[PDB]
Design a protein around this ligand. Structure first.
Ligand SMILES: C[C@H](O)CC(=O)SCCNC(=O)CCNC(=O)[C@H](O)C(C)(C)COP(=O)(O)OP(=O)(O)OC[C@H]1O[C@@H](n2cnc3c(N)ncnc32)[C@H](O)[C@@H]1OP(=O)(O)O
Ligand SMILES: C[C@H](O)CC(=O)SCCNC(=O)CCNC(=O)[C@H](O)C(C)(C)COP(=O)(O)OP(=O)(O)OC[C@H]1O[C@@H](n2cnc3c(N)ncnc32)[C@H](O)[C@@H]1OP(=O)(O)O
Ligand SMILES: C[C@H](O)CC(=O)SCCNC(=O)CCNC(=O)[C@H](O)C(C)(C)COP(=O)(O)OP(=O)(O)OC[C@H]1O[C@@H](n2cnc3c(N)ncnc32)[C@H](O)[C@@H]1OP(=O)(O)O
Ligand SMILES: Cc1cn([C@H]2C[C@H](O)[C@@H](COP(=O)(O)OP(=O)(O)O)O2)c(=O)[nH]c1=O
Ligand SMILES: Cc1cn([C@H]2C[C@H](O)[C@@H](COP(=O)(O)OP(=O)(O)O)O2)c(=O)[nH]c1=O
Ligand SMILES: Cc1cn([C@H]2C[C@H](O)[C@@H](COP(=O)(O)OP(=O)(O)O)O2)c(=O)[nH]c1=O
Ligand SMILES: [Cl-]
Lengths: 188, 186, 186
């Protein structure tokens, strides 16, 4: 079986924009579709939450249980980015230091929210069960491993692991040759 | 949108007690609501599970995917405590040692269940993707970092991290002033 | 309350095979039930996903949020195996090296998918918030701790923790006696 919205159901959601061959589980939660833009060949699985400003490009899988909280500043994924199961991307988070009250039950003047656009560049893969914090640019071709925590931007074409992550090895660039091949074969 | 019960449907759930401005997701699961008590100004998000004896105070967010397994002994949160997404708090867990059988498919006499009330004191924050095991007090103003695991009671006003957690620095107590200031305004 | 199908409805899913005393949440997702078999005395909780080929024996709990992505090669659990909440078992994953494109939006010829059957032998327990990767045999009686990642087969009767896992101590085998004692009683 599958849990995906039909094309009929999709156009009734009211995305700021949505492309072709978009498969979106009826069991995901989509909050504020008015600020959510999605390209072509995108699949979003059961129990995902997309909230606030989120922009997804094309050829991207958001695997089950993944939450994207784009808030006002937004989360943006470029083409060929993918996010494995049970990841959270936060574009805003509370201050844990004890210098501020916390969370949605408390008015803003008492909090100290850190917020900043989160960008996943082309070919980024986030491994399962990871967390990405606000104001983070995940550079082009970065892979982060399973159970990763990323609090700061990550330099392009490396593999990172750990809590918080550290750089462990280069990511190979062959995938860019494969991208160009795949795309060329779609044009001719 | 929003996925929350109206005041009207909340009253119909049959909670032991429920305050005002309580926003519970329709995509949460609530089992045994008659032993669940929720104070005022509480938000419980999609895909949470509250099961068995659970008591939440006021000014508390239980973020999405979080499971509170209160059992008979209970989990209690005090005011201004908050739990980030994908946390589990267990009040009962099976013995992993190899000395017992395990889980809800096996009769009690064969299992060796560790159980004890769990309490999150005032101003506790539990970071995302964390697990709290039974019979523990998360002390007043403690912050536990993301992806951490707690098996013992935690001393007040520290920040802890890791699996299992260790203490890394004091929690600032400015939030106490902020609490007083806020409530006054109220 | 509880969320399970009645045995009446269980029959209308179309599992390859499904035993008695099987409690499957209505809030779990089951994909390709035709290649799923389940034994007796099994409980699968809310927000689980069972996808592709998955064979579960008897006296097993698959706790809330757990996903079992069996693909074509399959995941198999033997009797008395249990999986705690928020675990993922993968029978197929993409190559992260940069030598291949990845995931379901891309044709197979550009990918380099690692696939291989995952087997949890009798008495295996997997701790919460864990990840098991393809082509892994988790040996009889193995316990894996919470928040652990397993990429290789694990030796029988040991306890493993960490990311990726390391062996820490032997598992006690009193359970083998308990199983014998319990089966008699029936
Ligand atoms: C979205 C699309 O649909 C795709 C999918 O969903 S695929 C399904 C999801 N898949 C995953 O999440 C896979 C994640 N894979 C990993 O984490 C892999 O371990 C990895 C690619 C990051 C590294 O693997 P590999 O390159 O084989 O490196 P390996 O030799 O195993 O480990 C190198 C070092 O990192 C450590 N390490 C590896 N993975 C780690 C992790 N996730 N966290 C912490 N440490 C890790 C090892 O301990 C080792 O340290 P040492 O050098 O100090 O001994
Ligand atoms: C519920 C309400 O709605 C609120 C929300 O939901 S907010 C969204 C959820 N937010 C979160 O989960 C944030 C969690 N934050 C963290 O884990 C932060 O890292 C932290 C607050 C624990 C510590 O941050 P900070 O004080 O800036 O410490 P930092 O300098 O990064 O690290 C100190 C040490 O801890 C380590 N560390 C930090 N966080 C860690 C973690 N989560 N696990 C393990 N180690 C950690 C660092 O490696 C460093 O170790 P070293 O001194 O040995 O090098
Ligand atoms: C499905 C059925 O319904 C059953 C259930 O759902 S039960 C609910 C879910 N329960 C769980 O997930 C429980 C998981 N339990 C654990 O992870 C336990 O820590 C454990 C059983 C693996 C080990 O506990 P114990 O044997 O008491 O060992 P302990 O002394 O605490 O730790 C030994 C070493 O391992 C480390 N360690 C323990 N657990 C760890 C873990 N999960 N990850 C990494 N390190 C761990 C300790 O730091 C210590 O390290 P050191 O030797 O370097 O100091
Ligand atoms: C994980 C998942 C699968 N499915 C469906 C559609 C998928 O084609 C099918 C099996 O998917 P999956 O287990 O993701 O395997 P693959 O995509 O590698 O074949 O089940 C859903 O509808 N929603 C989900 O969240
Ligand atoms: C995450 C989440 C949001 N929502 C709704 C109510 C929220 O006001 C809105 C967005 O919430 P959220 O994404 O948490 O951001 P914020 O806390 O800044 O509002 O969508 C739910 O109903 N359930 C949920 O689980
Ligand atoms: C966790 C969970 C519980 N329940 C219901 C049925 C269970 O008998 C009841 C209590 O479950 P739980 O809180 O897991 O504890 P126990 O081991 O005592 O069963 O809640 C569900 O229906 N689905 C779920 O996912
Ligand atoms: Cl989850």
């Amino acid at each position: 079986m599958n849990s995906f919205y039909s094309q009929e159901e999709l156009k009734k959601i009211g995305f700021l924009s949505v492309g072709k061959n978009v498969l979106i589980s009826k069991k995901a939660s989509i909050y504020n579709p008015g600020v959510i833009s999605i390209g072509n060949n995108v699949r979003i699985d059961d129990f995902c939450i997309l909230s606030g400003k989120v922009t997804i490009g094309s050829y991207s899988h958001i695997a089950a249980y993944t939450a994207l909280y784009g808030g006002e500043v937004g989360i943006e994924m470029y083409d060929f980015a993918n996010i494995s199961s049970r990841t959270i991307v936060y574009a805003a988070i509370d201050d844990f230091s004890g210098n501020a009250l916390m969370g949605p039950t408390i008015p803003n003047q008492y909090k100290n929210v850190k917020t900043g656009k989160v960008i996943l560049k082309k070919h980024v893969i986030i491994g399962a069960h990871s967390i990405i914090f606000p104001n983070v640019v995940i550079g082009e071709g970065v892979a982060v491993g399973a159970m990763s925590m990323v609090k700061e931007s990550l330099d392009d074409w490396y593999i990172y692991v750990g809590v918080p992550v550290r750089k462990i090895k280069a990511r190979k660039r062959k995938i860019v040759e494969l991208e160009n091949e795949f795309l060329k074969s779609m044009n001719s």
